[PDB]
Amino acid sequence: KAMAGNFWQSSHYLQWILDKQDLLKERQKDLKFLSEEEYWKLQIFFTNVIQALGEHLKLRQQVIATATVYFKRFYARYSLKSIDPVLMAPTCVFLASKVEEFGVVSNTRLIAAATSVLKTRFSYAFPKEFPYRMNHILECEFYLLELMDCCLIVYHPYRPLLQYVQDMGQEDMLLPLAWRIVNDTYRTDLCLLYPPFMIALACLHVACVVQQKDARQWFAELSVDMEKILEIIRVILKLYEQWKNFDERKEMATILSKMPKPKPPP
Amino acid sequence: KMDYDFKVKLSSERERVEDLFEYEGCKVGRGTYGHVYKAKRKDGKDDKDYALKQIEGTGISMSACREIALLRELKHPNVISLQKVFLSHADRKVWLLFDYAEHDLWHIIKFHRASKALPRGMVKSLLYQILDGIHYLHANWVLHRDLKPANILVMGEGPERGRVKIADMVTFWYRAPELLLGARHYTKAIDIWAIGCIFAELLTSEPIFHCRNPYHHDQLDRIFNVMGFPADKDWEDIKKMPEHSTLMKDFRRNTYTNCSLIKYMEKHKVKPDSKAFHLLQKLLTMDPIKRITSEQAMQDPYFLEDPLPTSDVFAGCQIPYPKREFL
Ligand SMILES: Cc1ccc(-n2nc(C(C)(C)C)cc2NC(=O)NCCN2CCOCC2)cc1
Missing domain, CATH: 1.10.510.10 (Transferase(Phosphotransferase) domain 1)
Structure with missing residues (x-):
């Protein structure tokens, strides 16, 4: 609720809506070691890992989204070699949990959750046990906070979506699927490239197409750059095609080996 | 397992509060919050006084996390303004710079x-x-x-x-x-x-x-x-x-x-x-x-x-x- 209607003055908008060409140029560092296809498959993988961690810790979906953005922001500018994403993922959940005012997740509870989730739900990728201890998290939290420039408050599409479907009066029919499609967009770069309300409208449009609801009169009445929504929709449609062709469980061990590992000191 | 080149590059570039500001024995207040100092820039491209708050405790506390989160978004002439945040890696203390x-x-x-x-x-x-x-x-x-x-x-x-x-x-x-x-x-x-x-x-x-x-x-x-x-x-x-x-x-x-x-x-x-x-x-x-x-x-x-x-x-x-x- 805090800072609800401040997006156009917020640090999210002014600093963390990035240019796509700036983003891809920084990614060319990692693309020496990985394919474009393989880098996207890492994003999807670590999106699932962060989701799994938040579920294990009984955290709310907005806390999970914030953590996913922190993760995305870090590696948007920095290499996969710089800090291990296995360390960064639970660190992002730990930092987000404080910001969103649920509480300081206990040291034991975090490290057990990180151990348990990878052992249970990601043993196909990670054969060895979760090696990091709580001192590694607390160090990583300092690096994460620094790079984000202390920008902790993050706006998500779940609020504007809710407002849009209430305006339609189609909450029961459309909200479940549309909300579900908002979750999927965190697999993509969309949240670094567009304001949350624009993503929300794109998700709502796909939910309408899927359930064969007509809303052209509703959509035409909005005062938004409609061509920019068709960009977001095209990303959402392309996403579900990659999903189909991507077998996470058969591929990710080999992709994770192709990641550039960190240089230890001399 | 952290990359050495990345580690030394940031450590080199990282502005340290002791280097940027002169505040030794200028403690304006102590309280729950921590300690507040009246400070001045050492590299004298500025002669205004700054309030410089070291936060009570170590690390990114719950209190510390909220203060940083909120003040980083807030901007209004009748509300106090956060200028900079220093994360001191050695002792894990957080410093907050305000106008004095x-x-x-x-x-x-x-x-x-x-x-x-x-x-x-x-x-x-x-x-x-x-x-x-x-x-x-x-x-x-x-x-x-x-x-x-x-x-x-x-x-x-x-x-x-x-x-x-x-x-x-x-x-x-x-x-x-x-x-x-x-x-x-x-x-x-x-x-x-x-x-x-x-x-x-x-x-x-x-x-x-x-x-x-x-x-x-x-x-x-x-x-x-x-x-x-x-x-x-x-x-x-x-x-x-x-x-x-x-x-x-x-x-x-x-x-x-x-x-x-x-x-x-x-x-x-x-x-x-x-x-x-x-x-x-x-x-x-x-x-x-x-x-x-x-x-x-x-x-x-x-x-x-x-x-x-x-x-x-x-x-x-x-x-x-x-x-x-x-x-
Ligand atoms: C945990 C927590 C503590 C404080 C804040 N906070 N909140 C405010 C609002 C936005 C309510 C005006 C200001 C501050 N902190 C300071 O002003 N700090 C400047 C230091 N001053 C304060 C007055 O006494 C002398 C030092 C937030 C969260």
Whole structure:
């Protein structure tokens, strides 16, 4: 609720809506070691890992989204070699949990959750046990906070979506699927490239197409750059095609080996 | 397992607070928050004083995480501004840089209180800028939760001469009666009551509800001594307060029969038919849902009456209040 209607003055908008060409140029560092296809498959993988961690810790979906953005922001500018994403993922959940005012997740509870989730739900990728201890998290939290420039408050599409479907009066029919499609967009770069309300409208449009609801009169009445929504929709449609062709469980061990590992000191 | 080149590159580039700023033995305040220092840039491309806060504890605390999160988004001339955040990796201490406020209402009032044994252009200006700062926060669903003179800073000599700056660092003098009757949650109304108490203190130089589990008997007794015991008609949902039966056990309306805010403010030489009093009464309403909002308060005709409020609270005069002593 805090800072609800401040997006156009917020640090999210002014600093963390990035240019796509700036983003891809920084990614060319990692693309020496990985394919474009393989880098996207890492994003999807670590999106699932962060989701799994938040579920294990009984955290709310907005806390999970914030953590996913922190993760995305870090590696948007920095290499996969710089800090291990296995360390960064639970660190992002730990930092987000404080910001969103649920509480300081206990040291034991975090490290057990990180151990348990990878052992249970990601043993196909990670054969060895979760090696990091709580001192590694607390160090990583300092690096994460620094790079984000202390920008902790993050706006998500779940609020504007809710407002849009209430305006339609189609909450029961459309909200479940549309909300579900908002979750999927965190697999993509969309949240670094567009304001949350624009993503929300794109998700709502796909939910309408899927359930064969007509809303052209509703959509035409909005005062938004409609061509920019068709960009977001095209990303959402392309996403579900990659999903189909991507077998996470058969591929990710080999992709994770192709990641550039960190240089230890001399 | 962290990359060495990445580690040394950041460590090289990372601005350290000890290198950038001179603050050795300039400790302006200690408290729950931590330690605050009056600082100056060593590499002298700046000669303004800066307030420099080292946070109590180690690491990114829960308290520390909220302060950083909120202040990093907030921007308004009557709310304190965060300039920079230093993360000191060695000791894991967090430093927060703010602009330096020379004065505050705790010292300003105490100075006038000492002068017995407060200009009304200044009072109106003070109140207006407080209401402007809170309206900004309340609009963004940010509550203060602990408004009092010491948290109302005022800038000294410089380009922001005499501008109020709302800040946030065991007395129940500015706490609203619903909290004393065990209200579960903080509210915008709770902030407005505290502003009413401050405005009463600015006019009289005396804390209107001076005194000394959620329940506090003697603090309630003081409120009723000044305000009078509230009628059922005045505050209907008082019955729904968790400590209502305890109130009825300990207190009797009859005790406070000759008591009113009118009668109190007459004793401290403030006319009850002035625009200043009628606004004060609207701020100091017992029922939280009968208090005017900060936006409504700014729209009061009190601020159209002569003298008009000014950006410089001091109105271009020489400032008689002494600078901050070091600790
Ligand atoms: C845990 C936590 C603590 C404080 C804040 N906070 N909140 C505010 C609002 C937005 C309410 C005006 C200001 C501050 N912190 C300071 O002003 N700091 C400047 C230092 N000053 C304060 C006044 O006393 C002297 C030092 C938030 C979260």
